[PDB]
């Protein structure tokens, strides 16, 4: 439907997040990042960049643009992109949950593939696989399968 | 450079 129980992961108000968040450490963000006025100001810039007319190959450009425009260290953006399986849509969801919950990476968030999530996918255990498909869905599941038979 | 070449983006509508 138009509705999704994933909305609660996107719905986070950036005005309730004190800036800079405690989780936003110098080893993940450049000095420019700490000069955004609010969490909303950063979010609005992140949305602006992410919405660029990129082509699937141009991950190297996006990582550079995220570094220059939003002050996210290149290696952290690459780390994020790998865990999102390239889904630029779930990029604003990553930071809102990372900042609200003060955990990096956010553990139980649909679309944010943890290390333990990948270890569960590696095993052919139907119990672990049910828990994964209940977290991310069959769509993200087949996308993650397609992703690692390559990576 | 290695990961980024193989990594495919899912752009916005």
């Amino acid at each position: 439907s138009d509705f999704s129980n994933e909305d609660i992961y996107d719905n986070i108000d950036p005005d309730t997040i004190s800036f800079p968040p405690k989780i936003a450490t110098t080893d993940l963000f450049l000095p420019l990042f700490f000069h955004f006025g609010s969490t909303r100001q950063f979010m609005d810039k992140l949305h602006e960049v992410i919405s660029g007319d990129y082509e699937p190959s141009q991950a190297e450009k996006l990582v550079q643009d995220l570094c220059d425009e939003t002050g996210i260290r290149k290696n952290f953006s690459t780390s994020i992109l790998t865990c999102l399986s390239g889904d630029l849509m779930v990029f604003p969801r990553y930071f809102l949950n990372m900042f609200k919950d003060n955990v990096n990476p956010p553990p139980n968030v649909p679309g944010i593939w943890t290390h333990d999530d990948d270890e569960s996918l590696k095993s052919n255990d139907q119990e672990q696989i049910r828990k994964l498909v209940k977290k991310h869905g069959t769509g993200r599941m087949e996308m993650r399968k397609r992703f690692f038979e390559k990576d | 450079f290695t990961v980024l070449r193989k990594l495919n983006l899912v752009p916005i509508k």
Partner: protein, 290 residues
């Protein structure tokens, strides 16, 4: 007391970061700039400004913010055209005219920004056809009193600065201005680096005057960590940005006011905060005010 709480520091940190950016971007040694930009940009008069001797990141970043802040109070349609990727190697006329909407505003300001800060690429990369087209577009806007052009050339390069300089002078009636950035002595540069880390916000704070004093006498003691850092800045290529970056990290890393002062006293070093850790991108710009 008040220098052992986290919520007090949370406020201070945000305020410090705010003032640090402001100071960095204020080009305090050229006070004329704001009146200059207001007089030249908030007029229906056409103008060509050559920002010559823009050798530092803070100069470009600072000028650019001042231009954005000036143009942000205009009300009549302001069209911004980024002339960099066009000039390098009547499609332009129509591209400008598409953004000219006589219904939303009668008068218009067309701001053309050309940025050639790299002195290494001295040989003219720009193609004469794209230059003579750009100069023709100007000759039209110059002849139509309804639309005013504002051409801001940011240059460090003079093989390109001289080429536009002569071409514009010849074909157009609009006389160009050269806003030359002053070259500071190591002495003066040092004075303005010290000024950048002096915070004036919340004047009635016992803690803030405690901070400013620490900075002053630390810099008056040549054996201190801060004075030694400033000594390195005398030879490092981007002193304002390096200091800005390191100081940002120190501020943001500290959890308490006491921890901030401890870092300023004992942790701020070339070894602890190396310049390798930062990107000194010459066309870099800081986030907006609000």
């Amino acid at each position: 007391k008040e220098r052992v709480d986290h919520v007090f520091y949370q406020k201070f940190k945000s305020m410090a970061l705010q003032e640090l950016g402001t100071n960095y971007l204020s080009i305090s040694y050229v006070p004329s700039l704001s009146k200059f930009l207001s007089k030249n940009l908030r007029s229906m008069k056409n103008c060509i400004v050559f920002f010559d001797k823009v050798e530092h990141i803070h100069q470009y970043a600072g000028i650019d913010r001042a231009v954005s802040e000036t143009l942000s109070l205009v009300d009549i349609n302001v069209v911004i055209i980024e002339m960099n990727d066009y000039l390098m190697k009547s499609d332009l006329m129509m591209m400008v005219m598409r953004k000219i909407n006589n219904d939303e505003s009668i008068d218009h300001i067309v701001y053309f920004k050309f940025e050639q800060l790299d002195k290494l690429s001295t040989s003219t990369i720009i193609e004469p056809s794209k230059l003579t087209e750009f100069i023709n577009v100007l000759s039209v806007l110059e002849k139509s009193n309804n639309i005013a052009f504002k051409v801001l050339i940011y240059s460090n390069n003079v093989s390109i600065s001289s080429l536009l300089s002569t071409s514009l002078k010849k074909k157009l009636n609009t006389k160009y201005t050269v806003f030359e950035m002053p070259i500071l002595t190591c002495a003066q540069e040092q004075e303005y680096l010290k000024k950048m880390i002096k915070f004036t916000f919340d004047s009635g704070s016992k803690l803030l005057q405690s901070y400013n004093s620490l900075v002053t006498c630390q810099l008056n003691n040549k054996e201190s960590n801060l004075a030694i850092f400033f000594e390195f800045l005398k030879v490092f290529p981007h002193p304002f940005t390096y200091l800005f970056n390191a100081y940002t990290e120190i501020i943001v890393q500290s959890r308490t006011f006491d921890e901030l002062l401890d870092k300023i006293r004992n942790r701020l070093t070339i070894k602890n905060y190396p310049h390798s850790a930062y990107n000194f991108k010459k066309n870099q710009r800081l986030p907006l005010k609000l």
